[PDB]
């Protein structure tokens, strides 16, 4: 274990970063920050605290924990909070890719 932004081991401190965060977006600062993010200050760009994985362009349906497992599959942060099983089912859907054919 070795955080990418050790000053964030505290979510409360990640909460503090979402002010310029367009409140209009479906993704609330409580969720994002909780999912290990923090707003970088521009647009809707938030980074992870324990893998520093960057994520922009968010849609009404995009869920923080969710997206944080789909593109940043290797985060020691997500893999420790929500577990591997959670990360699996996130990826294993695609259950739709074998239905489309």
């Amino acid at each position: 274990y070795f955080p990418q932004y050790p000053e964030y081991a505290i979510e409360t401190a990640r909460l503090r970063t979402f002010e310029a965060w367009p409140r209009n977006l479906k993704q609330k600062p409580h969720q994002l920050a909780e999912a290990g993010f923090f707003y970088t200050g521009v647009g809707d760009r938030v980074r992870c605290f324990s893998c520093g994985g960057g994520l922009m362009d968010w849609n009404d349906n995009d869920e923080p924990w969710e997206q944080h497992a789909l593109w940043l599959s290797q985060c020691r942060f997500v893999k420790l909070m929500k577990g591997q099983l959670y990360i699996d089912t996130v990826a294993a859907k695609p259950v739709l890719a074998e239905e489309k054919e």
């Binding site: 760009r45 960057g54 994520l55 922009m56 362009d57 968010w58």
Partner: peptide, 7 residues
Amino acid sequence: PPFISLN
């Protein structure tokens, strides 16, 4: 430092 878009 790039951004790994979600959508």
